[PDB]
A paper describes a structure:
Only a few metalloenzymes have been rigorously demonstrated to be cambialistic in vivo, including some iron (Fe)- or manganese (Mn)-dependent superoxide dismutases (SODs; SodFMs); metalloenzymes that play an important role in cellular reactive oxygen species defence. To study this process, we leveraged the existence of naturally Fe-specific, Mn-specific and flexible Fe/Mn-cambialistic SodFM homologues, which differentially utilize these metals to catalyse the detoxification of superoxide. By combining phylogenetics, biochemistry and structural biology, we demonstrate that SodFM metal utilization can be evolutionarily fine tuned by sliding along a scale between perfect manganese and iron specificities.
In the cambialistic SodFM2 from B. fragilis (b), all mutants displayed lower activity with Mn and the majority had higher activity with Fe, representing change towards its most likely ancestral Fe-preferring phenotype. c, For Fe-preferring CPR Wolfebacteria SodFM1 (CPR-His), mutations in both the XD-2 and water-coordinating H/Q residues were necessary to shift towards the inferred ancestral higher Mn activity. The likely ancestral phenotype was proxied by the closely related SodFM1 from more basal Wolfebacteria. g,h, Single mutants, but not double mutants, shifted metal preference of N. alba SodFM3 (g, Q/H mutant) and Woesearchaeota SodFM4 (h, VD-2A). d–f, Crystal structures of S. aureus SodFM1 LD-2G (d), [name] SodFM2 GD-2T (e) and CPR-His SodFM1 VD-2G H/Q double mutant (f) were analyzed to investigate structural effects of these mutations. The structures in e and f were solved in this study.
Author numbering:
A (entry chain B), B (entry chain A): 1 to 192
Write the structure that this text describes.
């Protein structure tokens, strides 16, 4: 049975980047529904007893994939943030890979922002690493996650409107720009 | 040169089904941006001088299509509502076609609701008529519109979260159920 992941911060701790209200709905309602849906859809199927990751890696398009992908996406999303990150940029191997693959962190930010803002409709902008250690930015529609393509997901921006509408309404770009301030690079680095 | 369509009611007139705030953002920002984007993108292309409808019917996937589809979708959407419709259900030819194709109005509502609630991500539930006079319910992802497929669009529900999030947050089904009270069947009938 799939369980709600625990937030490593209080509901109001990401203010003013993300409001308490947004967390209450985004985590407390949307993620809860996705978890509930996955627990309802799986019993008696080949997916019963599989991890979220394994479902995302295996399932074809459909409700199971949609819900598993959203569980995985939101889990990594919420757990990649911290109220007051020590570092506002990655170091070590991740830092070097970003310099190698994007020229610099600042250029990476620019490309990540553009992917986030340019994704039409609902989805996720993802930074991932492939099996040869190369980084990629992808636009995952709807509930998709880079695990399906055999990539290892490192950092994401949720550009479903529910992620920002109560705080930014239509101003997605403004929301995206603020997210950099709450990324917990220690968490992200450990995903490499 | 693409113009904002005129709302046939005041911004606050659909309360409490849709709030003034929602109309101010949905019409006054989102639709405005789509129209602005058409005015930015179309002049100087093969689409210059064409109607929105013709662009939706002809353009491939991409930003022009996305914007045109959204302009058409929102135009029909906003103009299909009235604060106090004359009737709560369609009459005449449309009334009969609905009975023919869905068994009854009530069953049509049920199937329309299910398409609306079941569309994952951003999109539009559409009732349309084909060239032989037969009705169809489709789920159009993102900016898509039935005109692309050669159908004539009659009635839609916008299930992009921006359409309802300020008023219903995650409770899409509740929003969908309330819309029926403000459908201006006189407008919809004349689209047949
Ligand atoms: Fe989300
Ligand atoms: Fe909309």
């Amino acid at each position: 049975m799939y369980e709600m992941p625990k937030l490593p911060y209080a509901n109001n701790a990401l203010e003013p980047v993300i409001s308490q209200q947004t967390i209450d709905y985004h985590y407390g309602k949307h993620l809860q529904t996705y978890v509930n849906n996955l627990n309802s859809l799986v019993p008696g199927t080949e997916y019963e007893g599989k991890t979220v990751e394994a479902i995302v890696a295996s399932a074809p398009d459909g409700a199971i994939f949609n819900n598993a992908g959203q569980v995985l996406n939101h889990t990594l999303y919420f757990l990649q943030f911290a109220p007051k990150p020590a570092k506002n940029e990655p170091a070590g191997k991740l830092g070097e890979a970003i310099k190698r693959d994007f020229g610099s962190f600042e250029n990476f930010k620019k490309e990540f922002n553009a992917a986030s803002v340019g994704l039409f409709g609902s989805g996720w902008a993802w930074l991932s690493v492939d099996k040869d250690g190369k980084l990629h930015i992808t636009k995952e529609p709807n509930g998709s996650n880079p695990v399906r393509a055999g990539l290892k997901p490192l950092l994401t921006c949720d550009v479903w409107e529910h992620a920002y509408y109560l705080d930014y309404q239509n101003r997605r770009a403004d929301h995206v720009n603020k997210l950099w301030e709450i990324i917990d690079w220690d968490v992200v680095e450990k995903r490499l």
